């Protein structure tokens, strides 16, 4: 049967991913796919589920799924988790404390890195305050650290808030690109369906 | 308006390397990328690579990936482009321009979105041959180069390298009627051009015509008298 | 092997409108902007359009861009003589991770007059023959439009060995010039009765002939 | 509160067997996961086997797939890693780690609890 | 404008607590990466802690659980609380605004923290006999004293030229130790008597030690 | 991060200070100058950038496994300690070990090493201290290694920092605290003092 299979292809197998500061969100519903093959896959170096069981995922049903995808550094995968602090968790992508879903990551050094450097994926380094869960910031306003307004002038305390991930084939795993897919599962009680 | 002055023209031997400079203008690096584009003779434009100083970032074009280096010294505020293992097909004019950046927030990327201010370009020549002064021969006027009382006489500037060669007539005193043709690049790698001037046929027995060939790369000047 | 494509040439009556087409794919125009450059022969290119259809300062509203899916178009209203140039479209293709320039489109304004080429053929000089070399020089000037084909003939038969010809170059009077050279041995020159330089321009041919002394 | 107790290492010949044990103590429920990291001489910590406790699902790296076997005994709340057909490549300091999730990860920093390492040496 | 004035340093007994301040001017602490960096007496630089503009705090492994970084936006001052101190923490502590990619531009003048004992301990003086193997060097070991300084003379000041009293060490025990040597000709080791006069004023210590060749 | 202990450059010449490590491509490099009794001052940021007001003599570069700071036309005002710091992880920073750039104001002088065994009076008090005294060396940069018989000893070592003595040379002292059993067990202990490639070693024995 294939009345409506889950279009995880457009997310996991996407030809290009977003930068973490501008992470994408895909809404998934209607369908019905299996997560055993996902969890039993030898390609996902990270597969962490919170409040839910990855292999008992086939037994459960929900209302909605949010498929958040982006690219970060290797040693930043640990931030994609509830209750984390750091450059990514504070300024790029924040998971709530009551997060219900799975965090999936895999090494993408074969795709998102080229000789000389893949200086395309970006991240937010400066922000006046931390992000609320699932908040997205794409502003390029010159960050102000002094009392004087920057007014579009890159002066003393006035710098750009974004920087470039530079990925090369010889870099270490902690600095190699990793594509992340965050699946958020919604609420449901007494699944008789 | 700003200005990007690149380094002078270059002539290189296959296998060597060339490094072109491109001076910026004040605080150009602030919110302005820089691209390196070359254009072969009679061909189109070809992006080679670029750099973004504010993001401390740079990328390269597939064709030149693995044989190019693009640096940006922000203290001097200028960029460089070094192409190594040069081939004859790398003969082109190499341009440097500032690129206005576009922000595609949907995918979280930052690429170049047009280059308004351009540099003046840097001509780079790659040929296996080395320097040689030209052999200048006179192209004498006769009844077969004469039409309607006007005679056509010239000079053949043959087998020289590299460009350029400048030709004048009678130390510059004769300018009208002169037609100096662009040089041809022979299969041997040497250049050859010609410069002709049309004069009244009645002046052949009264005025002496001398072509002044100057090939500065070889430090050679030739003054060739052209007689009937 | 290139992705972006433009028509090689384009014509337009003065004062009217022209469209230059730019064809791409999903990897460049699918998700990245496309800009337009204008380059005059001998000079350096300049930015004409930059965000599909934004105009920099100094670009009149006679130029307008447009983008729909995988295709782009440049329109020039009220054609003026100074608009005759090369037009390149370009977009940031990510598959190759870099900007890709179009093949270019040469524009020709039809207000200019046609001109037949002036051909002058010089035989080998006695000074070069004394150096055991021989070179026939055929100079072609004052022809418009800048496109000619040159053929050499030995006595009553064509010849292609030893022929070197330049591409057309725009002169000061906006006409074009070209030169062709035929290298011979001092024996090949004296053996034949005559040599001829044929210059074909717009279907018609002009031939000059020379003979040894 | 939470404490990981580790034991079972020693010296063995190439081809021998060895049984490592990791005793989890201060967990309210079964919703946690166990991983085994080994730190070769001069190398970093590298995961070799994972176990989602609430799901009883194992995952092994390709180099130890058919040779290693991870399992959990319920009453003692202890996870065992049975290492058969050992090779000199397996010589390393082995650590067991836990985290409040159901899954697996290759990054040691993603685990908040660690037991004291045990030595595994395979030579002749 | 643009100043990082620090204060709060001094001596503090081991296991004690001490709080450092970093008054800022022109630069807003609450909207900047503010860090603390300490430099042990004569070693390199060791980053200690930081505070994000968003409030996230991070610490080095050598100070985790013992140090705490905070700030006050009304006073525009960076703080660093230090608990359970030991002699390893004795250093000159700096505060600096971090720009991450653009480094640490503005630094404070730095305050000094000395973690050692108290009261006053007199030194133990041991003779450094001249070796039996044209010149010979003998000295006195002034070991385990606090606080500085001690004065060492030779033969009640009758011997000055050739005397070289080395600067003292600060042992990890918090106590000081120094040595004073005089390089004498080898031919006089048997006919002349050498006595170092070590004085420690805070302990009212006056020690005269005779230094003879080792038997 | 690994930095050389010290460099020595003639006045007016150019210094080069290296900063080595693993995977020095993605991460950037910053440099700091620390004059005596002064706070560090950022001299070069993001590999090659000079902040406002800092002379053009300074310059940086970085590729492979090595970054480099270049100080041209050196004056006595450049005598300081220079530290590199990477831009690696936004959760922590690491510094180099620092490099001393002694501007030469006098010729090179090798150190005079004097090693003393524990006194017979200290051993009776159940203590043992080896005293290694280093003096008359220029530039003021030395490293001390201790040895039991011929094995390296790291614990119990207390070493001063080089201090300028009267004749503008430098002095230092290293102490090895031992128990009388450890001192009587081995056959000899050694103090190894290195000063710009050269090595001076003194050895004492329990007799
Ligand atoms: C990932 O891609 C695998 C490759 O299969 C090819 O791409 C997909 C989109 C299908 O159209 C398939 O018919 C193609 O041959 C898939 O086998 C796999 O299911 C994909 N999985 C996910 C999660 O996207």
Author numbering:
A (entry chain E): 331 to 523
B (entry chain H): 1 to 228
C (entry chain L): 1 to 213
D (entry chain M): 1 to 124
E (entry chain A): 1 to 133, 138 to 219
F (entry chain B): 4 to 210
Manuscript text:
S is the major surface glycoprotein on the SARS-CoV-2 virion and is involved in viral attachment to target cells via the interaction of cell-surface-expressed angiotensin-converting enzyme 2 (ACE2) with the receptor binding site, at the tip of the receptor binding domain (RBD), in the S1 fragment of S (Lan et al., 2020). Following attachment, cleavage of S releases S1, allowing a major conformational change in S2, exposing a hydrophobic loop that executes fusion of viral and host cell membranes, releasing the viral genome to initiate viral replication (Walls et al., 2017). In-depth structure-and-function analyses of 27 potent RBD-binding mAbs isolated from vaccinated volunteers following breakthrough Omicron-BA.1 infection reveals that they are focused in two main clusters within the RBD, with potent right-shoulder antibodies showing increased prevalence. In summary, we have presented a structure-function analysis of potent human antibodies induced by Omicron BA.1 breakthrough infection in SARS-CoV-2 vaccinated individuals.
Omi-3 and -18 are representative of IGHV3-53 and IGHV3-66 antibodies that bind at the back of the neck and account for 9/28 of the most potent antibodies. Omi-3 achieves resilience by repositioning the L1 loop in a mechanism similar to (2), whilst Omi-18 shortened the L1 loop, which becomes flexible enough to accommodate mutations at residues 501 and 505. The second, right shoulder, cluster was seen in the full set of early pandemic antibodies, above the S309 site. As expected, these antibodies (structures obtained for Omi-31 and -38) attack the RBD from the front and sit above the binding site of Vir-S309. IGHV1-69 mAbs Omi-24, 30, 31, and 34, which show reduced neutralization of Delta are placed close to residue 452, which is mutated from Leu to Arg in Delta. (B and C) explain sensitivity to the Delta L452R mutation, since this residue lies just underneath the H3 loop in Oni-31 (B) and Omi-6 (C).
